[PDB]
Design an enzyme around this catalytic site. Structure first.
Site, short mmCIF file in Angstrom:
data_model
loop_
_atom_site.label_atom_id
_atom_site.label_comp_id
_atom_site.label_asym_id
_atom_site.label_seq_id
_atom_site.Cartn_x
_atom_site.Cartn_y
_atom_site.Cartn_z
N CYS C 399 0.93 -1.24 -0.04
CA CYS C 399 -0.05 -0.14 0.15
C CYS C 399 1.04 1.32 -0.11
O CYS C 399 1.54 1.45 -0.88
CB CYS C 399 -0.85 0.03 1.11
SG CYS C 399 -2.05 1.52 1.41
N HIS C 526 -3.11 -5.50 -0.22
CA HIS C 526 -2.97 -6.32 1.00
C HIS C 526 -2.59 -7.80 1.00
O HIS C 526 -3.74 -8.31 1.36
CB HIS C 526 -3.82 -5.77 2.16
CG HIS C 526 -3.69 -4.28 2.46
ND1 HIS C 526 -4.15 -3.25 1.61
CD2 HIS C 526 -3.37 -3.81 3.41
CE1 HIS C 526 -4.13 -1.98 2.20
NE2 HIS C 526 -3.53 -2.37 3.49
N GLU C 528 -1.65 -10.01 2.65
CA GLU C 528 -1.58 -10.84 3.91
C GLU C 528 -3.10 -11.38 4.11
O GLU C 528 -3.14 -12.68 4.24
CB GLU C 528 -1.29 -9.74 5.07
CG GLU C 528 -0.51 -8.52 5.13
CD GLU C 528 -0.94 -7.43 4.28
OE1 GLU C 528 -1.67 -6.74 4.63
OE2 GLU C 528 -0.44 -7.51 2.91
#
Ligand SMILES: Nc1ccn([C@@H]2O[C@H](COP(=O)(O)OP(=O)(O)OP(=O)(O)O)[C@@H](O)[C@H]2O)c(=O)n1
Ligand SMILES: Nc1ccn([C@@H]2O[C@H](COP(=O)(O)OP(=O)(O)OP(=O)(O)O)[C@@H](O)[C@H]2O)c(=O)n1
Ligand SMILES: Nc1ccn([C@@H]2O[C@H](COP(=O)(O)OP(=O)(O)OP(=O)(O)O)[C@@H](O)[C@H]2O)c(=O)n1
Ligand SMILES: Nc1ccn([C@@H]2O[C@H](COP(=O)(O)OP(=O)(O)OP(=O)(O)O)[C@@H](O)[C@H]2O)c(=O)n1
Ligand SMILES: Nc1ccn([C@@H]2O[C@H](COP(=O)(O)OP(=O)(O)OP(=O)(O)O)[C@@H](O)[C@H]2O)c(=O)n1
Ligand SMILES: Nc1ccn([C@@H]2O[C@H](COP(=O)(O)OP(=O)(O)OP(=O)(O)O)[C@@H](O)[C@H]2O)c(=O)n1
Ligand SMILES: [Mg+2]
Ligand SMILES: [Mg+2]
Ligand SMILES: [Mg+2]
Ligand SMILES: [Mg+2]
Ligand SMILES: [Mg+2]
Ligand SMILES: [Mg+2]
Lengths: 556, 556, 556
Positions: C399, C526, C528
């Site tokens: 990001c 993102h 993750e």
């Protein structure tokens, strides 16, 4: 009269007892005459039934009452001597109400828990609070009452109810309540969590009492925001949110509560006659605690055991040794030894334990040989005694350790090997120790020599008489019935063991010493029960004096 | 064995007793052998202490046990004879545990409420449930246990806990719980309000039990939406939401519970040996209830009182009269009369009460003269007896009413006016009634003639023997110690009073009758305790037979 | 459908979440299609408001829902993708009932918590349980519901009540309850104390639920006598008295519950279609756990921080790195570095922190540069990026780390030092990163690029495309609005940074890589949130591959 009721919120283990004792200690240090009562919600009327393993030691009072070891704490923290009635139990209360019903003291009404049991509690508390516990004649100013069990338990219900009513009988300026509860911190977050305090205090006011002080158990000193969270639940300022991390000694707990400022709050609430003073005698107690954390030097010495492991089986004994060791300025080391496996059969049949026990016994520069009942290990403890005598080690025999010190000297010194007790070996050819119970009018059958009795010194030459202060006689607590037979005393006169103490009746020999040895004595009483942290019991002091080698100097 | 525990939720007054009795009655009517136990959370070990005013009557069992009047209900609803142990009390439980501690049955462990008191409850319930209550030898199938007090009370706590544990010991197919609670309707809205049922059942499962049946007190029959609201709180279908408006008689309560369909649910849950049958003997009970609502015709007769007002002081007496009156097909009217103001001093000093009492006594076409202790009204009751004799009215003397019937006949008929009791007037010149307590081995001192004893008829000519069925002897319950002196019996032989009943020992005269009178008898036993709604006690039956004028016909 | 409600008894911290997740994991491993719902008694309707410090990270779902990080746990333990509605909150429930009142769905009745809020809970649970969470179309078999807070709290009251009612709606063979509670052991006695379990379960059945499983937190494995004491309070066998000492990893918790035998009990109670099988795929999970305890070798690498300390601010990030590190067979070390003090002002004004930060940054053989909002540390993180580029260290920008990777290359490589963002520096002369929110019909104003969006690879030459599996496009979760301005893309073409990924619209460049460097990439999504312990997210995997030096080999 002022009252402090101490209760627990979450779990029983929280040491309500050391709190209650410590509050008592502080108020005594402020010059107030403080009495204490303990409620044990158990059915047992008295301590006498207990086997020391599962519930612990049995304590003895001046009046002859067998009571809980928790009463002994109140006696060592406050310079006081309790009567049996400051132990209140469910058994005692229900039994007394039952008796009143039979008498018809109830006028043929029904008898109920409320009001009748609850009134019995209130009469008892009032009555006992009034009795003078200190040497001073005047009545007590404050009574500290500790209630066992935890709020919400069934056992405690008639007591909490009685105290709900009691708070009215005794005025507000006279009643106060301390509630102890747990602030558990999980290992991960470390956060001193609030919830159990919240629920238990809710429960308490649902029972009818409300905390005037809140005592907060932890592993570590408390956060302010945590105390403010507690405050928000429980109407209370953080300065009454007293807290207790675990600490090094019991002796510190009253110091911590002084730091927590409790005195100022009791002056404020209970209007106490503590006049305000810049110095109070607590400075001595502060010095003693500061000396306690300093202490360095050792001596390995044994306590000769019969049970498999120490829990509470020797609690007053270990405290007496510790009082002595502090006065001596040494760390005690207690080498616990099961003697029941130093005997020949298990010497062969569990040889690992046999060599282990001898390795412990070879570490001992001195031995304590405490009392006993039944036959467990009774053929084994005789080896530690004989070892101490022949190894010339400092020795103290207590109760059964004294009876075994007489028998062994007969067996080995006299050559009267036939000699034995009446407890074990009731068939004995020459019964050296025999059952001799006390008998009195108004009593049925023989009974135990139990409680304080006067023992008088036969001669000046005694070490114990010197340790005692060269007084003519002493008064010490007993709990037995077996004595050395009086007829067989004659055999002793020629040889080196000598009876230095005897009963007023003359019927019973109660202290012995062995000549030509550094220190070797036995007693029929239990000197532990008379020990106090400010002044040890002389026999334990003598043993530790001797064990370090100080004894000869001490007499000087 | 199957168990039904009956408990209360909101208030004690809800008549748990009539519920429990009624469930018992139904199961008996289904051919099951039912036993019943009552728990009285009160401290009193037995009933004997009670003064009948404040707690009521004292009931007597076959074994000689003094117990609560609530046990007598179980004996009149079920054709059973209880032993003392089916009354369990807090006093009994705690006393028994106390005794076990002294014995050492506890092996020197601590004794606690849990498990020890709770185990005592469970052993007792099991043990008693097993004992045969009916004439039949075989053990009982179901035990109905009623627990006194209300959930949440302190007194009940050890019992609810015991039952929480008990529900596991006895399997689920064997334990069931009935909870009774109140559905109060305010006068304004009339709405049968739910809230108390909700909270008490919450409390109950917070104690550990859960309702299997819910019993719902009201002034009026229940709404379905109200039962559905209850159902939504308490996990339960409306068909287990049993309800009880107040009703005309106790005899209806088992009828209402049959309408409520309880039998089908017990067959379903408790797997009962009730085989299903189209007719069961309950049809007889339905006829009796239908006859009870029909009843019309009166006779004013007196009960001679000593207390200021009836509450429960004559409860079994009034029931015995009522059983008789139903068999007679008359409404009883009981004219309660305080005799303690028909005597001369208060005749002068409260003349309103004196004329009122005579106006009542002039309404009586017959009199019952029940028993007594102490001296209250003992100079007054003698006037109702003399009145009945001289007015030729039907008479029954019971216990003290018999002792007063002997004394009065001596005073007035014999001219032995000097004659008096030993209770009152212990100075008496000619003690006609004397203390004669029973004495036995293993007992210390004299004791009351208490419990069932065999009384044997002296002669055939007796009315009581005829009412009894022309049997040689009877066995009836006693509770006294004063008897007519045996020496003074001689004075009687010439005159019209005669002793028709005597003890097996021969020592005591226990029944009397007066000749040339319509019916006049006295008894030393208490026939009320043997009465049952299906078959009255013969002496009460004889009095009512005589009072209507039926007696002569009845013998035919 | 089957339901497992998981609740807590004593304190909130007890990890109800890992229990619920683990039960889910096991049932999935048995081949059942499992869905999960979490109740968060908090007022917040969604996660979006939360500042990540105080409550943690914000998780993102496929549908674009912002939810709690506790939902992310259910997504990593079960191979599932949740919709926003499997987070139920007090805010959501009350808001929905409020809306229904306005509509008049309630027909002008009053709206109450009971039944109306409670019905809303029951409709929601039913409705959501039905929605397919797995890739498979068919509906779920079991729903695991975790309820936050602790029994007795106010917040939880409408949910426990709903579940009391729900247990009836769903049959007994379909509902089950797991209760977790604490068995605290004090350091002194070490005894695993029972009391809190007792009270909380009492409270629970006073709320209306009863435990079918009991989960027992400790520091150490449990005693049998302790479990038997628990059993005695709570109606339950020790085999349902499941226990949980603290352990090395979350991955072990489902292994421990298999050892505890939970599967057999769910087959027994919930009648599950688990057919019994000797092998189930859990053997793979057992191997992975056994590999996890084995692991040895290190590499120090940094995570570039803005907050003062890690709590939960990087939780999914750290898990993604850990998934990668396990696949790599290395221990991760996360070197947390506050970049907000590597900047020039604090470099001078707190020089201790400045040198400390550089010493950490000199330990890093690779760096992760995660996302951000506002201006905190935004002039500092640029130094770790420039350091990684000029020190030739392996790099991943996420990001805001990607937006800073574009700006720095412009500043340092291009010589466009005037270049800056629109977030910080809105005055910028050449705004390289500009606000570009997404706009759609039915929406007012611009909104965040939030949720899954398809990003398409511009060219074959990409490392990320290779790590992705040489797929044409990917779909990854976003949460932003600032993008590189599309006009300024031209300046880049000459130089070594290149855009490899772009939006389907073409409007936004979403992945960048730097040529002639071992590994250096930035992404707007993102990754993750898409990582799973069985298969890491490719960008994190690429960074760790590169950091060890494995990358070149991996492509082979
Ligand atoms: N006045 C006291 C009180 C306690 N102790 C020590 O503290 C232990 C008991 O602690 P206590 O305060 O009684 O709390 P617990 O017994 O742990 O639990 P409870 O709250 O039930 O008392 C004993 O071993 C005893 O040696 C003591 O020496 N002096
Ligand atoms: N509902 C209950 C349960 C237990 N007790 C009492 O609890 C005492 C034991 O105290 P404690 O050890 O604090 O309780 P435990 O049940 O042993 O629980 P823990 O494992 O936490 O010690 C017993 O005397 C028993 O009478 C009680 O009054 N009411
Ligand atoms: N088997 C029964 C039970 C009750 N009664 C009558 O009902 C009254 C007592 O009612 P009970 O059912 O015992 O309830 P209460 O005593 O009102 O209250 P509790 O619930 O405590 O019993 C008594 O006067 C008695 O005459 C009866 O005749 N037979
Ligand atoms: N555990 C409960 C049960 C009910 N209510 C509330 O109870 C109110 C109704 O009040 P009331 O009529 O006093 O309760 P009822 O359940 O109708 O019971 P009753 O039959 O006694 O009226 C409703 O608004 C509902 O929200 C509540 O707050 N908590
Ligand atoms: N399925 C899960 C559940 C928990 N955790 C880890 O465990 C911690 C949270 O534990 P949890 O089981 O949620 O219990 P707590 O949050 O401690 O307390 P609660 O009972 O309120 O959940 C998180 O940091 C998370 O990394 C995890 O990795 N995967
Ligand atoms: N009577 C209460 C008190 C608190 N809460 C809730 O408790 C939650 C916090 O949980 P937890 O941390 O477990 O409670 P704390 O009060 O912080 O206590 P602790 O110190 O044990 O965490 C808050 O969301 C609050 O709504 C509640 O529902 N009812
Ligand atoms: Mg204690
Ligand atoms: Mg908290
Ligand atoms: Mg009754
Ligand atoms: Mg209403
Ligand atoms: Mg959680
Ligand atoms: Mg315990």
């Amino acid at each position: 009269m002022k009252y402090i009721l101490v209760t627990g919120g979450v779990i029983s283990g929280i040491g309500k007892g050391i709190i209650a004792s410590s509050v008592g200690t502080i108020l005594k240090s402020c010059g107030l005459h403080v009495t204490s009562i303990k409620i044990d919600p158990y059915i047992n009327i008295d301590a006498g039934t207990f086997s020391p393993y599962e519930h612990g030691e049995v304590f003895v009072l001046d009046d002859g009452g067998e009571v809980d070891l928790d009463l002994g704490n109140y006696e060592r923290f406050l310079d006081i001597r309790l009567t049996k009635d400051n132990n209140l139990t469910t058994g005692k209360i229900y039994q007394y109400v039952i008796n009143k019903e039979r008498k018809g003291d109830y006028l043929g009404k029904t008898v109920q828990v409320v009001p009748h049991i609850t009134d019995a509690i209130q009469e008892w508390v009032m009555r006992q609070a009034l009795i003078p516990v200190d040497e001073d004649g005047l009545e007590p100013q404050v009574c500290v009452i500790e209630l066992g069990g935890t709020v919400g338990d069934i056992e405690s219900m008639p007591f909490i109810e009685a105290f709900r009513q009691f708070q009215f009988k005794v005025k507000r300026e006279n009643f106060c309540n301390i509630h102890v509860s747990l602030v558990p911190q999980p290992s991960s977050t470390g956060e001193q969590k609030t919830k159990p305090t919240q629920n238990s205090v809710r429960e308490l006011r649902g029972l009818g009492l409300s905390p005037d002080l809140v005592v907060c158990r932890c592993s570590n000193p408390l956060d302010t925001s945590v105390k403010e969270k507690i405050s928000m639940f429980c109407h209370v300022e953080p300065e009454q949110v007293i807290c207790v991390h675990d600490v090094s000694s019991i002796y510190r707990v009253p110091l911590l509560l002084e730091e927590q400022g409790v005195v100022d709050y009791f002056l404020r609430r209970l209007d106490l006659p503590i006049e305000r003073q810049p110095r109070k005698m607590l400075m001595k107690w502060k010095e003693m605690a500061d000396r306690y954390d300093r202490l360095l030097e050792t001596c390995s010495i044994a306590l000769v055991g019969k049970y498999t492991k120490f829990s509470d089986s020797y609690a007053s004994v270990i405290k007496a040794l510790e009082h002595s060791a502090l006065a001596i300025n040494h760390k005690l080391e207690i080498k616990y030894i099961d003697s029941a496996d130093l005997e020949p059969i298990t010497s062969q049949e569990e040889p690992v334990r046999y060599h282990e026990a001898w390795q412990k016994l070879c570490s001992a520069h001195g031995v304590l040989v405490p009392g006993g009942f039944g036959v467990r290990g009774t053929e084994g403890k005789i080896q530690a005694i004989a070892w101490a005598r022949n190894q010339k080690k400092p020795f103290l025999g207590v109760c059964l350790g004294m009876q075994l010190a007489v028998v062994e000297f007969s067996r080995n010194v006299l050559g009267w090997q036939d000699a034995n007790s009446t407890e074990f070996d009731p068939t004995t050819s020459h019964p050296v120790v025999v059952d001799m119970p006390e008998h009195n009018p108004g009593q049925m059958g023989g009974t135990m020599r139990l409680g304080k009795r006067r023992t008088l010194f036969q001669t000046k030459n005694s070490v114990m008489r010197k340790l005692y202060g060269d007084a003519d006689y002493l008064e010490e607590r007993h709990r037995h019935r077996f004595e050395v037979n009086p007829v067989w005393k004659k055999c002793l006169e020629e040889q080196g063991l000598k009876f230095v103490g005897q009963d007023v009746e003359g019927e019973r020999m109660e202290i012995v010493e062995l000549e030509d040895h550094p220190f070797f004595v036995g007693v029929q009483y239990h000197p532990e029960f008379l020990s106090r942290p400010i002044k040890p019991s002389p026999p334990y002091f003598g043993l530790l004096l001797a064990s370090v080698g100080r004894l000869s100097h001490y007499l000087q």
